[PDB]
Design a protein around this ligand. Sequence first.
Ligand code: NAJ
Ligand code: NAJ
Ligand code: ZN
Ligand code: ZN
Ligand code: ZN
Ligand code: ZN
Lengths: 374, 374
Amino acid sequence: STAGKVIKCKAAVLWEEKKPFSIEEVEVAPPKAHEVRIKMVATGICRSDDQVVSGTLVTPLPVIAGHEAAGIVESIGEGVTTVRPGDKVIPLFTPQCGKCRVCKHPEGNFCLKNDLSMPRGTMQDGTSRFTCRGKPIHHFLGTSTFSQYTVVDEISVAKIDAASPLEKVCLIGCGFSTGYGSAVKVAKVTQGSTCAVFGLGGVGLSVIMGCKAAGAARIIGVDINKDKFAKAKEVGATECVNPQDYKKPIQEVLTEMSNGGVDFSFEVIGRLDTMVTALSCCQEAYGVSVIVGVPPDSQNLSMNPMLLLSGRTWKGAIFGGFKSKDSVPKLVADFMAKKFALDPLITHVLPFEKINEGFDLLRSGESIRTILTF
Amino acid sequence: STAGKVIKCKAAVLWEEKKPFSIEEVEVAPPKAHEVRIKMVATGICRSDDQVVSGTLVTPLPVIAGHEAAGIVESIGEGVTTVRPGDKVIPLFTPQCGKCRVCKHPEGNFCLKNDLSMPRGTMQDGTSRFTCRGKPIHHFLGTSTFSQYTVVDEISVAKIDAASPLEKVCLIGCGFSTGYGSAVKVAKVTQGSTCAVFGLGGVGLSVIMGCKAAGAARIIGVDINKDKFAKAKEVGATECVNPQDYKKPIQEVLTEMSNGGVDFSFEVIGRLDTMVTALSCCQEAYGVSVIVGVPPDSQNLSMNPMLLLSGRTWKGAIFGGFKSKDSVPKLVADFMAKKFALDPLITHVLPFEKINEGFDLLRSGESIRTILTF
Ligand SMILES: NC(=O)c1ccc[n+]([C@@H]2O[C@H](COP(=O)([O-])OP(=O)([O-])OC[C@H]3O[C@@H](n4cnc5c(N)[nH+]cnc54)[C@H](O)[C@@H]3O)[C@@H](O)[C@H]2O)c1
Ligand SMILES: NC(=O)c1ccc[n+]([C@@H]2O[C@H](COP(=O)([O-])OP(=O)([O-])OC[C@H]3O[C@@H](n4cnc5c(N)[nH+]cnc54)[C@H](O)[C@@H]3O)[C@@H](O)[C@H]2O)c1
Ligand SMILES: [Zn+2]
Ligand SMILES: [Zn+2]
Ligand SMILES: [Zn+2]
Ligand SMILES: [Zn+2]
């Protein structure tokens, strides 16, 4: 009988860029028509959430960030047909409205109702469900998972298997699905190919998992932090290189290593220089390079279009190119059937109240995914 | 007989940039091992040839330019197995060695023996077959068709149908195959799609022909020269737009016209600014943009990688992604079988001696393809 009532709960509020989260009481309004209020069970720390703190991924402040999570439906608004109270759910930071030209396109997944391209920090109706100290607080990507309760639009939630371990399957809400889809759906990595993966965090390890699933012969991990190399080999990297070890630019090293350039390269960091380097290192006539990393807000890169004229393909994607509401329940079902592993991504577990310690672990280079439990 | 002897003949020599072609007597050495000497019958004037004069496409000078042509084999060197004296042939400015990693790849066509990436202006053996006034003259892309005779490496020539009309099929050497393949093979334009083609010269009109062949529902031609619109409509444009007619940038106009972005865009000009515009006008989640135009030497473009992260694909190609020696004889057979038209591309047919008047017709906006006849 919290149904129809304001919930007072703890959330991690970001009042200001480059400051710690403030764990404090917020007020969470009840769900309006076509909205769902979720009791959160577990949420992951994704670099994109850190980018919001850094100000390199811009979204209105103050905000409740968090987008990689799983919980249990507390109540549904009028007209909700796709989940019920007590259902296990994953919030979808990329919505699936099912009505727009993108949702109807066979390849498209970046639904026109997304809050990423031109962030408002609201529900679909342009208003907020969150109050803190009597002030309105922004949403993030229609999810806001750094809260004991959130409200999402129906197009931004998926029902998942009732027996799902939510402290693992929360990674299906971003990092795993993003990296794995980037390889198997966006790049379409082929059997016997040579891949280069720039960035060996939670998302680039998921890229390596997808390249290995697709049958790549060589998977070259690239990171300036050699501490990331052991786990990258465990999930399928055949060799790892640190650009800081070489006199030559790493695109030239990777071209030499691959006897004239790789089949598939992935930028999984979020830097302009590594996006150009990852394009350059794929073979000039038939190579494919996929941008996964989120670049710093409003900055342009510089490149020589002769890299494309020879035959390269350059593309990017959000959430691994997955249509989110169709894909997430299937990804959970596939996990439950042992088709891929999530434990190799989980390096740390903390209570929600230690969110700032979780961010210090990511920033220090010590963690892959920290999972916070409510 | 000329076989085994030096030929003295007329060629158009470019002694330095931004000067008219010099029509004069050159000496053409006989073919060495795995080389073919061709009597030229017809050659087209491609914008790429004008870019060598402008210095925006760098190749060593002095040079015999020309790459879009057809002629008749005069003689063959030792070891030549794929052509014989008297054969009709098209020189291949993109070779097909059949041995490199690119030639063996199912998609690849930019053979590693090409002279486009790092132009030397020689035969494969690093030497020239041309002298003029006692000076060695460079080759251009392994072809050098602005001459009554040329010598090419065997991997840079294809045998075509003995009954083919050389004054038309010379365009299969460059402009027609490039534009048509860019649409049907590289973009893989789909039935009912909306296409935007930037540049309505010979190559852009050939892109329109491919988009129409692939069953596009809308083909928007873009040119700053409105005199190009009537012919673009004859070959399949459904509408034409001149960016100079609008207060708004044309990417915004084309996004509004296509109710959120086109399925397929093509840059067929060679400008950095229209390469970025063409990418931007394709739908942000599923759009594809192909660079066909040759960009200006050593210059970088500036772009926001968020254009790719949302889901766009950006790619470029040489020669329409056709494997040159396999494809050219099949394109000629397809032409003979009336599967496509070339006459719409041909606005002017001049004797070879009028090469400069041919270039001035292109530069002035008055021609599509001028065919020079020997
Ligand atoms: N496209 C999407 O939908 C999607 C979703 C998830 C994450 N992202 C982005 O993907 C990127 C990675 O996220 P993550 O895996 O959580 O981050 P992470 O755990 O910080 O991993 C990034 C890795 O990059 C390494 N790195 C940093 N700088 C360089 C360098 N110059 N050269 C080589 N390696 C370097 C770094 O050491 C680290 O291991 C971030 O930009 C996220 O914002 C995008
Ligand atoms: N990729 C290949 O294999 C390949 C082969 C053939 C030609 N090309 C290149 O393709 C391009 C076109 O060749 P072409 O068709 O012979 O040239 P063309 O006949 O000069 O056509 C170019 C067209 O672009 C129009 N144009 C020029 N500037 C603009 C502008 N700012 N906005 C809109 N329209 C503009 C112009 O009026 C002209 O109709 C050139 O850069 C060639 O070098 C490349
Ligand atoms: Zn994320
Ligand atoms: Zn949608
Ligand atoms: Zn050309
Ligand atoms: Zn080859």
